[PDB]
Amino acid sequence: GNTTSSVILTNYMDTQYYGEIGIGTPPQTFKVVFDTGSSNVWVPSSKCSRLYTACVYHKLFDASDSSSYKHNGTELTLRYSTGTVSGFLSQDIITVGGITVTQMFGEVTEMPALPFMLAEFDGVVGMGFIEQAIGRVTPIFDNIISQGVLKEDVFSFYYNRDSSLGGQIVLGGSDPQHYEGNFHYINLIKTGVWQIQMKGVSVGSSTLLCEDGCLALVDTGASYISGSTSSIEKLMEALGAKKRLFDYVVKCNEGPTLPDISFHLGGKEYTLTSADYVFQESYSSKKLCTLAIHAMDIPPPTGPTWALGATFIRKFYTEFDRRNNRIGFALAR
Amino acid sequence: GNTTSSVILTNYMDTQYYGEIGIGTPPQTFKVVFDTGSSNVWVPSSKCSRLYTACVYHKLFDASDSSSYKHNGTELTLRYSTGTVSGFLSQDIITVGGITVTQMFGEVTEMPALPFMLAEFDGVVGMGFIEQAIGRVTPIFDNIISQGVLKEDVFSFYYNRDSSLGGQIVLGGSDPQHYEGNFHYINLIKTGVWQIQMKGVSVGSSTLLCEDGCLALVDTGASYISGSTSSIEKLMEALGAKKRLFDYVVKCNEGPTLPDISFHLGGKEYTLTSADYVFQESYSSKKLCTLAIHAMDIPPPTGPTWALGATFIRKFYTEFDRRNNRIGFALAR
Amino acid sequence: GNTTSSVILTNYMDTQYYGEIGIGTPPQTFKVVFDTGSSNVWVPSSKCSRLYTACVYHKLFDASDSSSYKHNGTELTLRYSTGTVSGFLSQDIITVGGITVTQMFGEVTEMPALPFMLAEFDGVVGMGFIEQAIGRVTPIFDNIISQGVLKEDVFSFYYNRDSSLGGQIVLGGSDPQHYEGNFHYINLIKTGVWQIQMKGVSVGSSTLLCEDGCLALVDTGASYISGSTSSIEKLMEALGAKKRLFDYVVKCNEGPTLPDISFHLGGKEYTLTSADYVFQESYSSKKLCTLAIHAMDIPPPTGPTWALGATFIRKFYTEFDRRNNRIGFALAR
Amino acid sequence: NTTSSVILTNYMDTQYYGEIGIGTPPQTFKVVFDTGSSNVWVPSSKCSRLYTACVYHKLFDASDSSSYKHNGTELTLRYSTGTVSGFLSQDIITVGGITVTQMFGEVTEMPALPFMLAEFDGVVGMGFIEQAIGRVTPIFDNIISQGVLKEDVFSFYYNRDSLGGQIVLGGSDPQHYEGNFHYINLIKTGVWQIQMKGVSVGSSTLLCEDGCLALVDTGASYISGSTSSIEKLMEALGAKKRLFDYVVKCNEGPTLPDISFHLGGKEYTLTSADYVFQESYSSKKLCTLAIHAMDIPPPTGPTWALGATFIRKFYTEFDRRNNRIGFALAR
Amino acid sequence: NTTSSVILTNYMDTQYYGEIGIGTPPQTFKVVFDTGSSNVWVPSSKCSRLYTACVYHKLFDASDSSSYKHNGTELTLRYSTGTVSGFLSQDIITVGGITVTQMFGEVTEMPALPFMLAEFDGVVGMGFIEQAIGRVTPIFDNIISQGVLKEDVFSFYYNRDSLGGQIVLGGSDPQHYEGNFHYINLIKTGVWQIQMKGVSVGSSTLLCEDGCLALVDTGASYISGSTSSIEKLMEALGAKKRLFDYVVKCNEGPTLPDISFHLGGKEYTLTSADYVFQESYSSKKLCTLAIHAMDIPPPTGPTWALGATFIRKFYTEFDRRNNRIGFALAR
Amino acid sequence: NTTSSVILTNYMDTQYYGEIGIGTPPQTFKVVFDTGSSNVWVPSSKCSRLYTACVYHKLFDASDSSSYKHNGTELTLRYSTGTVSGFLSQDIITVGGITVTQMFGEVTEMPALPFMLAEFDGVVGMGFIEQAIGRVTPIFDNIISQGVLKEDVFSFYYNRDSLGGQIVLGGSDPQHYEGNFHYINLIKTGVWQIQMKGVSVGSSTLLCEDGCLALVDTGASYISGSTSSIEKLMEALGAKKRLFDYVVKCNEGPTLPDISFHLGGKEYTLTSADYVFQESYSSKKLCTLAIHAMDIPPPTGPTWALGATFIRKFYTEFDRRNNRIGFALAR
Ligand SMILES: CCCCNC(=O)[C@H](C)C[C@H](O)[C@@H](N)CC(C)(C)CC(=O)N1C[C@H](C(=O)OC)Cc2ccccc21
DSSP: OOBOBOOEEEEETTTEEEEEEEETTTTEEEEEEEETTOOOEEEEBTTSOTTSTHHHHSOOBOGGGOTTOEEEEEEEEEEOSSOEEEEEEEEEEEEETTEEEEEEEEEEEEOOHHHHTTOSSOEEEEOSOGGGOGGGOOOHHHHHGGGSOBSSSEEEEEEOOOOOOOEEEEETSOOTTSEEEEEEEEEOSSSSSOEEEEOOEEETTEEEEOTTOEEEEEOTTOOSEEEOHHHHHHHHHHHTOBOOSSOOEEETTTGGGSOOEEEEETTEEEEEOGGGTBOOSOOOSSSEEEBSEEEOOOOTTTOSOEEEOHHHHTTEEEEEETTTTEEEEEEEO | OOBOBOOEEEEETTTEEEEEEEETTTTEEEEEEEETTOOOEEEEBTTSOTTSTHHHHSOOBOGGGOTTOEEEEEEEEEEOSSOEEEEEEEEEEEEETTEEEEEEEEEEEEOOHHHHTTOSSOEEEEOSOGGGOGGGOOOHHHHHGGGSOBSSSEEEEEEOOOOOOOEEEEETSOOTTSEEEEEEEEEOSSSSSOEEEEOOEEETTEEEEOTTOEEEEEOTTOOSEEEOHHHHHHHHHHHTOBOOSSOOEEETTTGGGSOOEEEEETTEEEEEOGGGTBOOSOOOSSSEEEBSEEEOOOOTTTOSOEEEOHHHHTTEEEEEETTTTEEEEEEEO | OOBOBOOEEEEETTTEEEEEEEETTTTEEEEEEEETTOOOEEEEBTTSOTTSTHHHHSOOBOGGGOTTOEEEEEEEEEEOSSOEEEEEEEEEEEEETTEEEEEEEEEEEEOOHHHHTTOSSOEEEEOSOGGGOGGGOOOHHHHHGGGSOBSSSEEEEEEOOOOOOOEEEEETSOOTTSEEEEEEEEEOSSSSSOEEEEOOEEETTEEEEOTTOEEEEEOTTOOSEEEOHHHHHHHHHHHTOBOOSSOOEEETTTGGGSOOEEEEETTEEEEEOGGGTBOOSOOOSSSEEEBSEEEOOOOTTTOSOEEEOHHHHTTEEEEEETTTTEEEEEEEO | OBOEEEEOEEETTTEEEEEEEETTTTEEEEEEEESSOOOEEEEBTTSOTTSHHHHSSOOBOSSSOTTOBOOOOEEEEEOSSOEEEEEEEEEEEEETTEEEEEEEEEEEEOOHHHHTTOSSSEEEEOSOSTTOTTOOOOHHHHHTTSSOBSSSEEEEEEOOOOOOEEEEETSOOGGGEEEEEEEEEOSSTTSSEEEEEEEEETTEEEESOSOEEEEEOTTOSSEEEOHHHHHHHHHHHTOEEOSSSEEEEGGGTTTSOOEEEEETTEEEEEOHHHHEEOSOOOTTSEEEESEEEOOOOTTTOSOEEEOHHHHTTEEEEEETTTTEEEEEEEO | OBOEEEEOEEETTTEEEEEEEETTTTEEEEEEEESSOOOEEEEBTTSOTTSHHHHSSOOBOSSSOTTOBOOOOEEEEEOSSOEEEEEEEEEEEEETTEEEEEEEEEEEEOOHHHHTTOSSSEEEEOSOSTTOTTOOOOHHHHHTTSSOBSSSEEEEEEOOOOOOEEEEETSOOGGGEEEEEEEEEOSSTTSSEEEEEEEEETTEEEESOSOEEEEEOTTOSSEEEOHHHHHHHHHHHTOEEOSSSEEEEGGGTTTSOOEEEEETTEEEEEOHHHHEEOSOOOTTSEEEESEEEOOOOTTTOSOEEEOHHHHTTEEEEEETTTTEEEEEEEO | OBOEEEEOEEETTTEEEEEEEETTTTEEEEEEEESSOOOEEEEBTTSOTTSHHHHSSOOBOSSSOTTOBOOOOEEEEEOSSOEEEEEEEEEEEEETTEEEEEEEEEEEEOOHHHHTTOSSSEEEEOSOSTTOTTOOOOHHHHHTTSSOBSSSEEEEEEOOOOOOEEEEETSOOGGGEEEEEEEEEOSSTTSSEEEEEEEEETTEEEESOSOEEEEEOTTOSSEEEOHHHHHHHHHHHTOEEOSSSEEEEGGGTTTSOOEEEEETTEEEEEOHHHHEEOSOOOTTSEEEESEEEOOOOTTTOSOEEEOHHHHTTEEEEEETTTTEEEEEEEO
């Protein structure tokens, strides 16, 4: 085909990156994370009870104010690394980046506050495959590629650092104005899932971990780079950080000195320098700085897997290949 | 009539201002915000489940320990700017400031933690009109004025700054020992709602906003001065603050220098100096100070409306006129 | 008998102290607080909905993966000082410290986020008596003592300060390598509850409170030393601290100077020096330090009672006597 | 039967200002109320934006004001740290809830220093006419003639680093002091100065035995002394001049003497607390004291001037009937 | 049709470094890019762990690198604060997305001081060959011969205390400046120095009337001057040398002059903001300024050197075609 | 078969005290345990509240104590920073879990300075009898005669800025050291001092070549030296005396030498870390060092005294059988 498109995203604390789509005719405008870690679309409903406080706080979809809605009704529960949202299915037209498709998505009427009361975004747009789509509902990407319109079955992400542009996706391509050198692709391990083989993690200078090959899910809808508790713990122990309940942290004087960590994907080595991983808002002996790596256990559906989220993409411009099933990396500029 | 009365309130972080009432015979004592932004009375129930953690944390009303209770039973759901509480109706005698009335109020059995786990008060006393009373239940004020007892159908609020007196309401009047100059009244725009016409907001020195007339609900039960997201955003942009999810904030060195904001109500101009709006607990280049203005969207029931809460009353002693439907302002001393 | 045993615990912020047990055959491993303030065992279920976010975050018990489970099914709701958990009963073998017993415990399917989203532990092991066991379910201790195996019907706690060993329980005894001088016992006030008579609290140098005898529940599963709001308030007022919603706090320069507080239990006096009570992470005029005493109201089941939690045990190694119903104290080393 | 309080801002314990409206409808500005002078001045639009000080502070815009009443007589106002020069004009200034018509000055020349540091825009003098530059009738005098206040008095309260302070024109507010005041009489009308009979550092009358003068200034931050008496004192405090400011070590703070200003026949005492600025107790850091030398000139000065430092201590009441000053403990 | 940006780290506004890979597969290190020199050096495994500086920093390990190409000619590199000594070797260094083969040095002797304070491991010179120690062809020259860049240019952007900075080798990135540049021409090829025609503190050309030299160094943190001209300036700022560094009081910050570097026929101005390090506005504390004397030696030096301080101000473009430097406001 | 540890508080790394009970039922107070002296003293009710130091600290109230046993012989206790004067009395003091009867002093005259800075109430000497003022049998000697301890030994552990420290009377706790100790022998019984054979700043034996003395004081915060040797050292550290305390710049911290105390034939080394107080790495701020001159008098002093600074380093064991001191790395 020959259309190319991008949505443009907003970067929030480097921890949450959202763009906009419009459901419905008159469009309802919601803010959303474009997630390769799942395959479903949902936004909050008007039918959600406001005794859930997150629904008091995000925009809701009213469909009886939509000329193009179309009733469905099956229940659908989404489980994620880190919260469930439950709700029901519906269809209407959704506009992502000037491309309009009629997508089947979920209207959530149960929206847990933790974490969702802390989300600046409204829902989620899974960029995943049919395979991981609860309810076996076609996903936006597969639908846009039906439309015969893109010049390539590729979408790419640019995540920026923070305080113009917060990020950018491009559908049907890759803006070469935000990467350099070449791209390097790792073919998908099974398919119907963005999982890649990962050959080893070096902290400093040696394979402390990942050592006989592991899995690396490349996930845009994740903020941190994470691994199992068990190798998280270990990496942690090296680097020298404590546990504060949900994140590790180092004293900030120590900060600009943690070694580099490396990620060995296809004969290349993705290294992250200490600043790319620590959230330095001090350099002070008395104050705690947390790092951008975490523990997360994702179950055998697909995990155990290391997940490479924002930490990572923010350094390496990523393009996700459909035509060919693989992922490629190149250096963000 | 010729009684005058006041409750005396406690000021919490300048963000939450509560007094005490007693329901029931033997009184049960609950702490409450006196709210002109709504018209209903509710307190938590004993019948509330303690799996809602806010009910584990506030006092509950047991009515089978009340000689004067009187069964009702309709359900009633309260929606507010910022949380829902749901529950059922009941009647008992309520004592506000030495005046005893038998009021129909709600027993809440669903109490959302966010925000209510952070409330120092137990419930709410709407000071609003029958009109905005869910369930079309008479409100305390209308009942006290039935009692034939006040010398005037007026109540007034004094909110203090913080660390004696945290505030004070006076029923049937106004203590002139806490205002100066004269009062200035703005008549109520429609009636059955404390809404007034508001002619323009100046940040600095020019009408950046409110410009062709807007609405200003004067609300005692609100802590911040707020407007729609859309003009909030804009004011914000001027003044120079960021967004931290729920509030804006400025670096504190910048702090004692944000310009003044003005509120144009009836040919007078309500100005707030920078200190009246910023919560300065630092003056430091490295630390964030949040401001006392926020975004809040209140729906067409009554909003879009700017809401003038504590920020505002704390500077201008406010009296709310019943006899004559209007609001008057005077300078708190 | 002649076995003695200890579990070893982890100390988290001096505020939460957990050890490990294994339910089920293959063991499922959960982390738990050993609580003398209650008498029931529970851990989270797999059957818990993940729309409760605390269940997404703690390990769950699957029993259909347990060869030795045994179905029960009665509902059981646990109310505590500070949250409810609700769930259902089950039996399987539980291993505490190398001792294996088959215990009837609860599988929680409702787990409130606040507080449980902030708990590093998974459930609880009540060390209390049959008497306070909801559902009149035998407790682990009574079962282990059935097993005929301990040399004494005693368990003891060592809580450590913080950043080797975080703590230690010993079943059937007391490690003399962690106390000094002698032990001193206060016999249990009624029995079927760890409550002791408490003769007076001195702040500084005089009985400000507790003065005509009061109750002191000795509770390991509590972090702070607390009393009723009403005498908390008062003690507070002396010492000189404010209220921040849930804790009091003092300015930290003031910090290393609050007087000592004394606890008069059986002709001895338990004194706590200012550092044992304040959480000093500054000494600065501009910053707030909170203290390790709180208000808590526990209802007439057993309260009003002062509760002596971690604050206290951390200074005085405590042994709880079964054989003889009493409690003894000795100085932790 | 009136009284008018005005609420004050405290910026760092070093400046306390509050607000006024000049004009109709009123143009509002941050003013410092001083017992130090007698003239009212706010910055002017006619102020060149060449002066940063004028670029960054609010300007009075005269025709945006209906009561404006031209005068243009040129004024220079030399304080004891700062000349600003400008021109006389007229209007209504509303202070508290009072509404007065006064002659104020519109400044058009502001020094960056000291003023790019002031956080308020101007100054309101609570001083006599004798000290006014232009013998321009000041605002308390003008006010005291409307007949409305309840007393020819005006007090001050200033907080420690909440409120900030308050002026109560017309009387006092008891909510802020403890005790009953003691007055100490005006050494001569014209200036808010009294006679002080000995500054006793620590234990024994060290300095100023044998009287001297203390002006009482609501518009200064420190307790000032002349350079050398300051030297003598400090030498005694055990502090040393660092670079700028004298210093003592955090630790050392709590161990310092008390100074007591013998005055009026009663000894007014302050402590280490009271005069030292404790951003720490760190033996590892240095602490500033809130007492600074200030040599001011021959009629007024040479004199001690009891500033925010002393006022933070004792609530003050300036009294015009009796041309006396009272002091009670501030609370 | 290329360009290559490299992203920079800012440590305290005092050092900005970014990364490089030496080797195959590439061994990556934190480098400072300097207009100050012309040689590339990273620490060596052969560095004795006797030198802390070598114990704590990353070492180049040559046989862990297939392209390694021995040379061993001994180098000493004397900068204007720091000699490090080492030996010549070969390899491929990849910078941005470029991939070059260069002769770099493996240092084996590092001074603790200054280096146990550097946070990056080495240095990359963007200076001429004439200034290279060994007349060793530098990395921009080597690069400019692959034919790939889009222009014989390389610019710098450095943030205030987020990104940090960027080099854009080959051209400029507009996203970071406002305006159109003005060049000011190389006083003679060989060094990145220009002629400056007057440093005017505050209002009137105080110093350097009558030209002088300013080297433009991407690798220095401050604006340096010689000792006494620094003295003269500061004397004028009203600062005083404390112990180490000159100081001014927080308060006093915002009141200081502006310095403007007259150069190229255009006046390049900085302010108080621009040159003072404001960890406070506290009248109760002292503030460092980001301008420091630096006497450097006779051919190069004596000269002014416009460091991170000036670069933070004006985005820079070093231009090799035209052997000129451009400046636009940084944004 | 006993041992008795006592848990210590660390206030700023500058004081470590712990608790004692004097009386029946025991009246408990914060004491510093010193190897510096030999007498036990807590403040007295009979202390006049004229002395702030006595107003703010806990007082021993003798008849609130059944074992009280009057004596009234007047004591003055002159330390090397502080005389306090008082009177001898009797009672039972319980320390750890031991319960001893001793003669302590009830102080009635406390100096504000140094004491309005102490945070504990008194002092417990772990020194010999020879050094006791009154030749009053000290608490370790009295204790060592109940027959109960396991060894004529008592050690110390002090944390970096959690626990704080511990004394273990009777023996050592391995949980806090690594390694096996090495003793270095008492230059003469009477005092806890040894002979030190050279203080080598940085690399070469700079000072004290040719022996000198080091008292080992559990009750001092720093490593002290005499004034001029301190001068010589520091001069070498590159620090300068600021006002009070010597200073070095944050940045500069990590670059400083190591000092190593040659003693006992083994070299006891500390580093920059070890002796510098790093409230920052800011090149923008100044840092204090934990080594301070302290000229103490002719028999005892002149001598070096290895304080909290050195003890924080090496865990210490004072040994009375063998009248020797051991040191192992603290952990
Ligand atoms: C059932 C389909 C999902 C199965 N798989 C997963 O859940 C995978 C492994 C995780 C899934 O992609 C995650 N990243 C998507 C979510 C939305 C749950 C991530 C997530 O919760 N967030 C990511 C947002 C984000 O990181 O943007 C980059 C940040 C955030 C803020 C507040 C609440 C949630 C939230």
